[PDB]
Amino acid sequence: TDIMRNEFERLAARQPIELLSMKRYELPAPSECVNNSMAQLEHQAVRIENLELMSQHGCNAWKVYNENLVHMIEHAQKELQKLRKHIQDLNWQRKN
Amino acid sequence: LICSISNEVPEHPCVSPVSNHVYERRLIEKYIAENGTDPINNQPLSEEQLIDIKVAHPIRPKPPSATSIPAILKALQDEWDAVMLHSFTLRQQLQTTRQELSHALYQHDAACRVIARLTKEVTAAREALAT
Amino acid sequence: ATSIPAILKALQDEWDAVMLHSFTLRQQLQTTRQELSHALYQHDAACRVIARLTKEVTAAREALATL
Amino acid sequence: LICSISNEVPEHPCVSPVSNHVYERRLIEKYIAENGTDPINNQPLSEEQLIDIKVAHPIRPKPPSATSIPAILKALQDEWDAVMLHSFTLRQQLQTTRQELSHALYQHDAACRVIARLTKEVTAAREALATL
Amino acid sequence: SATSIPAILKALQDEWDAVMLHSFTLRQQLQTTRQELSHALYQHDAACRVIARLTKEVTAAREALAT
Amino acid sequence: MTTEAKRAAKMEKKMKILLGGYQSRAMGLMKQLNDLWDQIEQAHLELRTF
């Protein structure tokens, strides 16, 4: 019960073929390329500014998100116990 | 800690007041517009009935190799691959389950008739020893 | 039409359906597995009724036969 | 990860359904038994209204990562929304340079007519005086 | 459009590829308009030094005409 | 490209050294959570069975 999204998604899974992305940026060639050069410069700037924020930003968060994942995990195993305890009781009852 | 629709770790979790279960806002907002009821309990639920729960901007750090280039090309491609091949595989899991249930029931019936047939057989054989 | 910001908005809107579809598909998946599990358990449970019943029926035969 | 009332790591988290916030069951239970209210917003709340944290249901999740499709899409918003501000830094600075260039080229065009007349007048004064 | 989805992947690739160059071309033009502006400021201040010597040659001429 | 990507590679390798360890740390946690969510359903299913 979805729009166009479902038609191309089901076709991609049935055919077993992922849609091709931009295989351009990585290769390139020295000596149109004035644009390609200026795109590279800006890209690098973004990465570097972004990378710099990310290290410092990453450094600040590099482990703050890891703590959240431990709070998320322990909650699941508490429910594993709560389910374990009910079922055991039921089994015991049946046995008796 | 997770969403009860997609299997996400929500960025803006919101709880419904009819059935205490945390959903990601976008996915619960979509369900209410499709059919105005709670997805799990099938109880009457609206967009105003929801209650947002503070998350204080869930930790998602940006990778060291983060640029406009991979985020446009490689990362966004993988996200619509992972959405496509999962729901297709999830649609494959529904039907299988249904079929399984059906056949299970079918097999189960055949044994009931054997027991009912043997319940008349045994006690009358025991009764004949009594006679 | 061929801009940029709404393409990402469109990508969200189609994903919003993807999640809603995966939910209803999983509900029926697990809800059918409950019927599968309850049946298979109750089947092999009802199967042990026969094993018991067969051996008693058998005991009634040699008893009456030898008498 | 934290309990908002005490500030500890809660060992039994239960989320309320009036002010969405993760409280420790043993702490919030005593807050409700004191008075039937939610500690933050002071809205009415009972113990049955409070709900423990649970595994969603039957759909299996994975932790929040950079791979995950939704986290990758919200990443590309950050990319473009930051690059859109990068364009303002160059659009706003261009409107100062071209505005200073416009007044500079006007002062150049207003001045070079006076250089042309002094080159005329100083040579005309040398043409006049030398002949006499 | 009805548009094939594998193609929509390569569109978003091309559109990011285009915006990266449409941001680049707009920045090197800003640096060269400021650079060519700085070449005008040197000529502006160099010209008003050359007018001071030309005014002296006119002042020297007005003294000789009087004599 | 030279100035920025050299800074990027320095920022990346400095982050990577600190964060590839924290990535591995995070990945494991995520995997564990996933697994747990898998045991949760089998116990709920078996609870409703029993």
Author numbering:
A (entry chain K): 63 to 93, 105 to 169
B (entry chain r): 3 to 133
C (entry chain s): 68 to 134
D (entry chain q): 3 to 134
E (entry chain t): 67 to 133
F (entry chain L): 703 to 752
Describing publication, verbatim:
Pre-mRNA splicing, executed by the spliceosome, proceeds in two sequential steps: branching and exon ligation. In exon ligation, the newly exposed 3′-OH of the 5′-exon attacks the 5′-end phosphate of the 3′-exon, releasing the intron lariat and ligating the 5′-exon with the 3′-exon. In this manuscript, we report the atomic structures of the human P and ILS complexes at average resolutions of 3.0 and 2.9 Å, respectively. Comparative analysis of these three late-stage human spliceosomes reveals the molecular mechanisms of 3′-splice site (3′SS) recognition, exon release and spliceosome disassembly.
The ILS complex exists in two distinct conformations defined as ILS1 and ILS2. Compared to the human P complex, the overall organization of the human ILS1 complex remains largely unchanged, except that the ligated exon and at least nine protein components have been released. These proteins include four components of the EJC (eIF4AIII, MAGOH, MLN51, and Y14), the exon-stabilizing protein SRm300,27 the splicing factors Cwc22 and Slu7, PRKRIP1, and the ATPase/helicase Prp22. With the departure of Slu7, the ATPase/helicase Brr2 and the Jab1 domain of Prp8 are only flexibly attached to the periphery of the spliceosome and thus no longer defined by the EM density map. Following release of the ligated exon and its interacting proteins, CWF19L2 was recruited to occupy the vacated space in the active site, generating the ILS1 complex. During the P-to-ILS1 transition, Cwf19L2 is recruited into the space between Prp8 and the intron lariat. Cwf19L2 closely interacts with the intron lariat and four domains of Prp8 (N-domain, endonuclease, Linker, and RNaseH-like), which contribute to formation of the putative exon release tunnel. These interactions stabilize the conformation of Prp8 and the intron lariat in the ILS1 complex.
